[PDB]
């Protein structure tokens, strides 16, 4: 598994401790590391009290499949991590939402998958755990102490979310035309009306690459060449103190704009570091997140940069005659 970006796994004591909303980007990254975002999501939506990711952190979150290309890169953000950063919103599951089969759902308290419309997360209540189907919450003494390890969290798909450059409607409609020409045998994906079909089969699991350029629905492709580029923008750097924890808003803004905070060489050319003396324990220091950059997809002729590029499991209704 990949490492923590900033902070190690949390050691929680009081299950009713309030979760604050710290403005710093590095502080948000540290919260993401400790699975504070999933705990806050469960509190807000599923009437859950306590914390997940106890003593394990984000490193050992379960994935489906276990072998995930983007999991080994720590800096790559999952849909939940993107939710905590304000990029997207993970909705609470409704009755119509579909739970994909295949993952081991026994004991899980939270699991999210990227649907054809948006992102849906399922959560179980306090003192309860999902059953093997993933459709039910049942009583469990294991999830009773109020502190749960990271093996209770499941993330579905090989997802990677990132800053998005907006694209106009004409490009999106061309991409949709390419997708519908490339997938003529699909009629519904997660209940969202795909190309017209007079005959619907039973829903089936479907593993397919997709992008979230950002519109009414996602774009799924079969052939594509994805390139990775490093821009070393301000989003690629996380600034932290010596050993205590992430820096605050003021220190982060000072180091990232004034350019008087020492760090590594990449940050030195990107922004500018402090040199000369070395006793700068109070001063923050900034490094680059362990990600291969941002994905640029070359699909359907003209190439776009998506918001989220992934390889997940969805539900499809194939055409019958």
């Amino acid at each position, epitope marked *: 598994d990949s490492g923590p970006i900033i902070c190690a796994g949390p050691i929680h004591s009081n299950k009713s401790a309030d979760i604050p909303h710290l403005l710093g980007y590095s502080e948000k990254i540290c919260q993401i590391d400790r699975l504070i975002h999933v705990s806050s999501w469960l509190r807000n939506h599923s009437q859950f009290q306590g914390y997940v990711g106890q003593r394990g952190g984000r490193s050992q979150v379960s994935y489906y499949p276990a072998e995930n290309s983007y999991s080994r890169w720590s800096g790559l953000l999952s849909p939940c991590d993107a939710d905590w950063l304000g990029m997207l919103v993970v909705k609470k599951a409704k009755g119509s939402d579909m739970i994909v089969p295949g993952p081991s759902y026994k004991g899980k308290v939270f699991f999210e998958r990227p649907t054809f419309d948006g992102y849906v997360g399922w959560g179980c209540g306090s003192g309860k755990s999902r059953t093997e189907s993933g459709e039910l919450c049942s009583s469990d003494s294991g999830t009773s102490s109020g502190l749960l390890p990271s093996n209770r969290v499941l993330w579905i798909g090989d997802v990677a979310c990132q800053p998005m450059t907006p694209i106009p409607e004409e490009t999106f409609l061309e991409l949709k035309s390419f997708s519908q020409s490339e997938f003529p045998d699909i009629c519904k994906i997660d209940g969202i009306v795909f190309n017209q079909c007079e005959g619907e089969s039973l*829903p089936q699991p479907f593993d397919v690459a997709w992008m979230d350029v950002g519109h009414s629905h996602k774009i799924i492709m079969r052939e594509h060449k994805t390139k990775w580029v490093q821009e070393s923008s301000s989003k690629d750097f996380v600034c932290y103190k010596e050993g205590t924890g992430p820096c605050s808003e003021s220190e982060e803004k000072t180091c990232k704009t004034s350019g008087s905070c020492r760090g590594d060489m990449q940050f030195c050319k990107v922004a500018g570091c402090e040199h000369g003396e070395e006793a700068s324990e109070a001063k923050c220091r900034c490094s680059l997140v362990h990600k291969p950059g941002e994905v640029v997809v070359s699909y359907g002729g003209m190439r776009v940069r998506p918001k989220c590029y992934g390889f997940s499991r969805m539900m499809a209704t194939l055409e019958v005659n």
Partner: nanobody, 115 residues
Framework: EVQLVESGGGLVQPGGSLRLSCAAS????????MRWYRQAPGKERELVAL?????????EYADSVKGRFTMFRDNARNTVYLQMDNLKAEDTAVYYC???????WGQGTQVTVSS
């Protein structure tokens, strides 16, 4: 086309026993996961019993009805049943037949448990 009929409801004293039925037309339950639903008056719906044909045909019940509800299916008559035992007054509701991952739903039957 797909139509699910719902039948088998009625009045019964607490501690009684009754069996529902749900015929499936246009598709086979042998390869489709099925769920049983119920909506008590004045409140929303929730799962009751699932027969996951995609998980080896294992039955599964909610904690509120576990130990009192039995669900099984036979493919010969293309019908799915829900045997109910030790019914309490809390179980008075309308029960639905629903195919997993799709909007095909049943018309619903009333099961009333009272003295």
């Amino acid at each position: 086309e797909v139509q699910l009929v719902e039948s088998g409801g009625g009045l019964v004293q607490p501690g009684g026993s009754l069996r529902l039925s749900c015929a499936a037309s246009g598709f086979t339950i042998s390869n489709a996961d099925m769920r049983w639903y119920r909506q008590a008056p004045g409140k929303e719906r929730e799962l009751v019993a699932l027969l996951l044909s995609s998980l080896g045909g294992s039955t599964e019940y909610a904690d509120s009805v576990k130990g009192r509800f039995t669900m099984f299916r036979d493919n010969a008559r293309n019908t799915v049943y829900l045997q109910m035992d030790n019914l309490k007054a809390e179980d008075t509701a309308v029960y639905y037949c629903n195919v997993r991952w799709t909007d095909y739903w049943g018309q619903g039957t009333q099961v009333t448990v009272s003295s």
